[PDB]
Amino acid sequence: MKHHHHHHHGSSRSRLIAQAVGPATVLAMGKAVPANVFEQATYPDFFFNITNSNDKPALKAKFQRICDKSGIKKRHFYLDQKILESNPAMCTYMETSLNCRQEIAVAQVPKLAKEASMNAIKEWGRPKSEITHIVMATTSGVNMPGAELATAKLLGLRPNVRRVMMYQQGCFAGATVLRVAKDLAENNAGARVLAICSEVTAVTFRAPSETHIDGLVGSALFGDGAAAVIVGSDPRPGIERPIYEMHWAGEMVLPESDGAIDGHLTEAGLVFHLLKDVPGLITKNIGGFLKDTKNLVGASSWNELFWAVHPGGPAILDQVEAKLELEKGKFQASRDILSDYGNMSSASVLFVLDRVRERSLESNKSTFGEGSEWGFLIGFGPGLTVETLLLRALPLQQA
């Protein structure tokens, strides 16, 4: 260790560098979606036209039916007429097309992530140089260097930012980035984590086929979007304001769910195959999984909690709601996102959490959790994994 013009000559057993004291907290949230808006009502027309499937009326009627019951009003896509016409392979069913899909995704994911991040950083109000870690997830393509570095570069973060990139995880990654951010923020004094999820449909988009019904469901639900969250423990008075506190983060693989959802990255892009009743498996096991955690804070009723659930589709929301006998308004934030954005994979649940904060603000509620002190952020996906975080919502001033 140098001192002035001379020198002097650390922690044997104990830790050389200190950890934080308080629980990790959500300090800000931001989001972004591409410019092209596609109304669900007439999406079948565009879809069957661009994929040259107009001579398949029965299949189109099937897709229209799926779209009509999707609970989705509109979706945002980077993909448009021009891009798809310039990439005919992507408009076929299974023709070799990974290279053109990767070219699109590798560029769009970090771009959308940067916008969501800037929105979060703007609400946060602190210099981007204070960001010490970046944690990111996407199921839209893979590259080396990863999308997290591409994003950090677009944002102009410090060269020594600690990174965690989690590619190809699926619909439960929204909860995953927060679980990872929680430990990074809590175990490092002063740490401020930028947690991101960015998804684009370039890798999954493909022509409809009666030989791939699962593909029909995906083409009706998946949309584009990115969300960013600033996470940190020990908020500084005056310049930072906690919205939620993270107190528990866990997950589990559901019994008898092997093969429920398989995702294969192939020469033709990403293809999903479903084998079991996902909504059923989740509904049957969700209660037992959550019970233990609720008990940690003495919560007895499901309705005393607020919910930020991944809007995988209308079926999962309806069945869980019924199973837990929740008041109609408990899942409204989730339904609001499904309606305005569709299923944006991992970023969806983050959009839902921001919406919970939004509804609390506009409805003059006593907390950021629409009036409830404790709540669950839930994500689910492949392996039939259910991820969950127990959040405590901070007080919100009322009129």
Q: Would you tell me which residues interact with Ni ion (CB under 5 A)?
A: 3
Rule CB under 8 A: say whether 295 interacts with a copy of itself: yes
Q: Which of 67, 91, 171, 197 is catalytic?
A: 171
Q: Is 159 in the site for a copy of itself (CB under 8 A)?
A: yes
The amino acid at 65:
R
190 binds a copy of itself (CB under 8 A): no
State the Cα angle at 96 between 95 and 102, rounded to 5°. Answer: 125
Instruction: Compute φ and ψ for 236, nearest 5 degrees.
Output: -85, 130
For residue 393, CA distances in Å to 239, 256, 307, 312, 383 come to 19, 34, 11, 24, 30
Interior angle at CA 343, CA 350 and CA 70, nearest 5: 135
Residue 360 to residue 303: CA distance in whole angstroms: 16
Annotated active-site residue 91? The verdict is: no
Backbone torsions φ then ψ of 275, nearest 5 degrees: -125, -20
Q: Which does 249 bind (CB under 5 to 8 A by kind): Ni ion, a copy of itself, none?
A: a copy of itself
- Per-residue contact flags (x/-) with a copy of itself for residues 296 to 315, judged by CB under 8 A: xxxxx---------------
256 is an interface residue for a copy of itself by CB under 8 A = no
**Taking the chain, what is the end-to-end CA distance rounded to the nearest angstrom?**
56
Is residue 255 near a copy of itself by the rule CB under 8 A? yes
Residue 192 CB, nearest approach to a copy of itself (Å): 14
Which of 317, 228, 323, 217 has its CA nearest to residue 272? 217
C-alpha to C-alpha distance for 352 and 130, rounded to whole angstroms? 26
- Asked if residue 166 binds a copy of itself (CB under 8 A), the reply is yes
Piece of 91-99, 198-206, 330-338, 352-360 that binds a copy of itself (CB under 8 A): 91-99
170 binds a copy of itself (CB under 8 A): yes
Q: Per rule CB under 8 A, is residue 321 in the interface with a copy of itself?
A: no
For residue 3, the partner it binds in a copy of itself, Ni ion, none, with Cβ less than 5 to 8 A by kind, is: Ni ion
Cβ proximity to Ni ion, 3 vs 15, nearer residue: 3
Query: Could you list the active site residues?
Result: 171
